[model samples]
Target chain A: MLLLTPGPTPIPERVQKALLRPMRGHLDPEVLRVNRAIQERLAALFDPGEGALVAALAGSGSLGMEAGLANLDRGPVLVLVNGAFSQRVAEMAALHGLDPEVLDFPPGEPVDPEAVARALKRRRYRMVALVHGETSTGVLNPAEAIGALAKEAGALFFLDAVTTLGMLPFSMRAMGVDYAFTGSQKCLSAPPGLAPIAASLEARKAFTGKRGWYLDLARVAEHWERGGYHHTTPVLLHYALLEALDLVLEEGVAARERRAREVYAWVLEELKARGFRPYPKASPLPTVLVVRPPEGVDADRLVRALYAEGVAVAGGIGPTRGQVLRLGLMGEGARREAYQAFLKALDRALAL
Target chain B: MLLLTPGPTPIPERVQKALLRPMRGHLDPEVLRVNRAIQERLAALFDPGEGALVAALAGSGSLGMEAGLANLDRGPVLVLVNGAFSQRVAEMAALHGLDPEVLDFPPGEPVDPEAVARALKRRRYRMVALVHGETSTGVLNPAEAIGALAKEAGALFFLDAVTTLGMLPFSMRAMGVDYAFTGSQKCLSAPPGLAPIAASLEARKAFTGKRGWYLDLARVAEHWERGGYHHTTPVLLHYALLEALDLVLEEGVAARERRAREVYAWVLEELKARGFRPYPKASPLPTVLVVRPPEGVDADRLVRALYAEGVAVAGGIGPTRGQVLRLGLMGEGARREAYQAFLKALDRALAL
Candidate 1:
């Protein structure tokens, strides 16, 4: 099935071939070398070479998010919420017993960089979290600017670049992101697993014996970096990620961005040709588009019809459920061929 | 390198073959089938078909202990500490804010069943936890009797069978164990990554939204059972476990137990020939043996020397460190050949 639903994106055959290799212990020198290679590439991509790289094995972006928050040594956190994932992070902070203050933005507006800079200046935060691209609402949070604000305020900056990792340029160092996290299922076009987390030396130190032991970056990093334990490193995904990194490097991040923009451009052109109107414009992310369902047409029914055509899209998550049809222009699936197929299938699904 | 250590044991080529398979998404139909297979086999192995089985994505036995403590429906817990893992459970209980009382036993002695009975009778507890086989001192807690006591006292009984699975006959249902957990690297002979947990239907209900989201058994089970969204159940490891289960079923639990006993018996014979003494005199588990180091030989040095000879054995954990060496008899490794190889290496290392 064509995956146009944010994560669990389409994986190329080459990456799957890598996953078919022999299993090695997490500490095996060969696996560690590969682990280092992935981390090095991530460090370059992150542009924040100041931190140690720790890998967490999981299927969701939340694992890295949870790991970062649980490992934080700071007292309180301020979360800027433009949509669902940011609000979810605030809830996680509270669940983990950290007091979090959330700065809410308007429904469709990008979080104003100047407003965030003002907030950071007014208050001394132990930590500030920003979601670069909100898959829920399809808006980028002006992450680079927010990162600068956090740096100016002298707080550890945590950035979730789950959707934006390859769709846009990620410069954690220049952006002042102390802890940056991403996932494989989005921009890498790899199967969902293996969370890529980059922590500044200061961020990794906060992980010692924190929240949950298994997810603790310090222990995982110790097993990964100091000791040679290959069995613990989630080796198969390591192999898959290696192949994914290769493709990303070959395509180059700039080309990847071009590919995504091209797909969205086609989607908009096709929509206008069909006499369809877009949702009231918000600062929507290039990777995803949220369009309102037609009057009197149930979104789920349209989605089921789309699914029958072998194109898998999804309804909006949480509060926007059934009201919006979300399409992903992401990773390997961002090509023009893939989007045309989705649009063709959507036209039939809508009985146009 | 050989792994004679208590965990991270040598898996068969067949098991490694399973680990090399493609990673399936958490909700994939194949993954659900595998999860159910694991749950069914685990229920039979640990609960003897009495309790419901649930799994957690974690390393070592510690995460399973936390799962039991954090999920209990009622308040306060009382733990019987006869070795390191049990004391860890007690500590974990404290971490979860449970009023945990420990009936400490000598490292080499069986937990006084009478003391357990007394603790249970004296206190009203929501749950009571015990390590079935103490890997730290190679002591075995009398599960059938201890579990009976916990049951009679109206406290739900939980067992950490991390070191006992596949090597011994532990009928959770027959022994009155309401909840039980095991690790893959132990007697299961699977690589590290996931922990297998089972609970009596009653015990399973205890873990509600009150527990942490990831560790919540209700959510975990629902994902496995209903919607199949148990959040990334390590795909390859489950296949490895399926193979390990096949091996266990091929030999039958009775034969596997007999083989474990035979290997441990051979190890004891060789130890006595070298004028060695085991740390614990109480009935030790068939899977592991804790023996005091010879005079003038540093235990850590001995453990290191053994490893240098390609025999990876465990040094005492925590309280037993520097005092004992933990030798393991697990899965395919619990055989006469492994015993011979271990003794020959020990003889050369100790110059005996």
Candidate 2:
């Protein structure tokens, strides 16, 4: 069956083989070399800033999202919650013992940079956290514009690129992002268990904050920079991630982004006649599309229909559940053929 | 090549195949059913007591170790430190903003239950944390004895089962362990990147403490219990872990424990003539044996020589680094044939 969820996207065949590589101790020199290689690729893809550190942590993207906050100094922050993903950052911040000021936006809308600027001027924040792609709403927030505002206001720019990293256009350096993270299984199309994260060179020196031993950024940096032990490196996942990065880099970054955009456009064009509507009022994330079915159509039933057509579909999560249909064309899943297949399935499901 | 390291020991063929299974969205019913099945087997294996909860987290065992601490009430706990792994628990406790009073035993020695009893008598603690097996020094601490003391003194008992769970005789229910966790790559012989953890029903009623959103036990519990979304579940790792547990359960718990013990005994008995000595003065963990090289031997070179003989070997880590030799016969790595091959490789390495 085809997997078309927002994350844990379909794994490429090459990645599957990489996971079967001979097991090696993390102490092995070969494993350390592979570890170093993955960091360099992550650094390039994340593009946080010059001299930034990139670490591949062994957990889902949410873990890395928390790591971004857990390693920061304790201070009031502005969390732009346009969707569930954005609210999650605020929740994590709260768990870290900080009550972040959450500025809520309507569902299916992007975080407004102008409003964020107004909030920035009203209060001093240690960080301005925003989502690059709100998977729940399929809204690609204006990272560049909001990032500029955060920098001007002296707040660190934080981006969650979980659904946008490899298949979409993202440059943390260009966006002035101080810290950012992406899921390996999303746009990267690696297996699920690793989150590649980076911190800007300036942000690197900012805080040596309180965090558990596992997610501590400094120790993770040491693991990447010096090949020291942070935890037992998930060698299989690391190997598979390297293969995934190879695929990403092989297809020129711009070319892959364009391909994802085309597939998403094709999806929208094909489904328009079927009475589907893009849920987000703002620009939809190319890697994932969250859409509303025809008037009076049950989103959950449509998802089950699509599953019967041999493609697994996602009914929305969090606040959007039962209201939107979610699908992805992430990395390996972003093929023209896959999009065509999805369109065919949508046709069959909707017609019935 | 033989994987002689402690954790990430070796992946079996069945697990490799499981990893290659067609990807499924986390929202898929099949995936959720598989997730629930894995939990049931995990529940049986952990035996964490009636109404206790078990969760398979998407990270290394270290993450679960921290999760155990991060999800607990901020209290002055008593940490029993005899090796690096023991010290690690204290470090996690400290990161959680609790300066745990540590009771230390010398390296290559087990925690003295009698000393723990005295410590409990002198001062009250909210929890008593101990390691079931110290991989750093190869000593299996007397968990049952210490658990009794902790419970009698009104402190919750926490166990780090990172190196022992599947290959050793562990009864969390009998031992009075309030919380426990183990790595997937150790005796379970699955791929790395997953940690299975359990918390007792009584401890379940304890404070739902401060933790980053990702590792929060209550959220993870919700993920396991109600199929709620905490994070994108690492589907492939979860699949392989189910297969690994199938192997464990098929082998029979008592039988696998006996097999690990016999393999460990044979490895020592085979090497004694070659002048090798077990490093730990107390009982060496059957899953991993850390040994001292003969007076004039270089541990690193011996490791390299073993590599040439078609085996990957681990030199000691942490405080024991370069001071000892580490090898494991964990789960699949604990077979008689593998042990015989290790003996053959060691003989040739020392001959040079």
Candidate 3:
């Protein structure tokens, strides 16, 4: 079946082969090498020059939000809530005992950096968190502007880069993002297990308290850096992620980002021809194209029908559910052929 | 390389094939089928009765302990610490702001039920947590007795069955365990990514309040039961775990447990003759054989030497660090042939 969802996207064959490679002890030399290579590659991709330390943890991208929030010292936190992902980050921070103040924005709109700046000026926050790409609404939040505001406010910026990391080009250091995280299965085209997290020096310095043991970033980073055991380190996931990162580097980040942009444009154009419109967003993410169904069509039912015809686009989640369908132009799925096949399937499924 | 570590033990070819199965969206119908099948099979293996609901989460086994502890409503928790795993459970509870009372036992020793009863009589606890098979020292805590004490004390009992679940003959129902968790890479012979957990209805009843977003048991179980996206759901790990569970049920849990015992007994006998002794434990786990190295032989160096000979046994961790080596008799590795090969490698490494 076509995996056109936002994540657990179509994995590359090479990365899949890496998944099937013989199991190795977590602390094995070869496994350690893969772990180190992944960390190095992640640093180069997201935050090079050692400004941000990259580490992989054995969990989903959501866990990264919890880890980032849990590691921060006790202080007031500002969470910018535009879509489901940012809302989740705020809720996770609240769950971690940080009664974080929320800067709310419309679901399909980019985060208002002016609003964030106003809030930051009102109160000093230790950390400011927001999602880079809101998968729920296919909107790209104003990460650079909000990040700069947080930096100017003397607060660390935490970006949820789950959907934007490999598909879009952005530098954590340049954007002043102290903590950011992405999943392996998104544009990386690897299996879902590891969350590649990048933490800047300031973020690491603020990470002086203990979170939960399993999601402890400092301990996990130490294990990756020095090669002691921390939580049995998902061995095969590391191998697959290393291969996936290698693929990204080999493909060249510039070409990959351009591919996602072009494929997303094609998908939007084709969907428009079919009486569907791209879901309105102030700044839409190129990685995922969220489209509203034609009048009198059931979005969820249409998604099911598409899957039956060997296509798998995602239905909207949270606030946007039942209103839009998401076609992910991520990793290997960011291609003319894949979107063409998906368009054909969509046309057949929507025959009226 | 032979994976002689407790887990992730050797992966069978079929299970590896499952890991390479084509990617599926987390909400796909077939993926939901696999998810439900895993939950059902987990129930049959760990908590046969309908009393305990089984679910899989995309994290290591250690995360499950935190989930179990964090979900309980605000109250005092009792942590039974006999070895490294149990100690971790306690530490995790403390980290989560639960100043749990620890009933400590020496490493390589089983928890004394009498001491637990005394502690229970002294003060009431909202929950009692312990490890069934402490992998750190290969000691099997008396889960049944301690569980009964917890039940009599009117507290929920949570068990860490990471090393015992598929390799041992035990019933979560019979032991009166309310919450129990195991890892995929242990007896399941899958890659390390998923954690299979069982929570009794009563335990679920006691599960009030928020833990963290990603680790919330009710929300995760709801996604598995009623087809919705919670986390990304680690699609490949689910496929591999379902296949591994199929192997477990096809082989018959009783026969599988017996095989692990027989293989462990054989290793103990053979190693006894080679001037090595099974590390003393009041009750030892049949799944992992922890044995002291011969005098003057560095345990870490010996583990490396065996690895050089294509064998990979884990050296002691924490309390037993540099004192013993742990050979895992788990899943496919719990066999006479594997142990025979490991023994030969050990002899050559020791220059016997």
Q: Which number leads on DockQ? A: 3
Error of 3 at B140 (Å): 1.9
- Model 1: per-residue Cα lDDT over A1-352, one tens digit each: 6767776677788886676565444554566788778877777677766546656444356677777887776657888887777777886777676678888886556788888887887778888988888877777777877887887788888888888886688887778888888777778777665777888876766644355644567666666566633223445677888889888888888988888887787787787675544542566688877676657767778777887787877666654566777777778668788887988898888883
lDDT of 2 at B238: 86
Q: Which of the two candidates, 2 or 3, achieves a greater TM-score against the reference?
A: 3
Looking at model 3, the pairs that clash are none
Give the whole-model CA lDDT for all candidates, comma-separated: 0.73, 0.85, 0.85
RMSD of every candidate to native, in Å, equals 4.2, 1.8, 1.6
What is the model-wide C-alpha lDDT for candidate 2?
0.85
DockQ of 2: 0.78
Worst 10 residues of 1 chain A by lDDT: A227-236
Each candidate's chain B TM-score? 0.95, 0.97, 0.97
lDDT of 3 by residue, B1-352 (tens): 8888998889889988887778888878888889889988888878735756678878988777778987887668899887878888888888777779988889988889999999999998988998988888999888999989999999988999888788777788899999999888898888888888888888888887576778888788779767766788788888989999999989987898899889988889888888888885668888899999887888899999999999998999878888999988889889888888898898999993
List, residue by residue over B1-352, the lDDT tens digit for candidate 1. 5667777677777876675564444544566788778776776677545347566453345556677877665568888888878888887677667778777888888888888877777879988888989888888889889888888888888888887877788787788887788777678887655677777776876665253555667667677667544344556567877788777777888888888888788788788778778888878877887888767878888887876676777788767977888887877668788768888888889883
Q: What's the i-RMS for candidate 1 in angstroms?
A: 4.2
| iRMS (Å) per candidate | 4.2, 1.3, 1.2
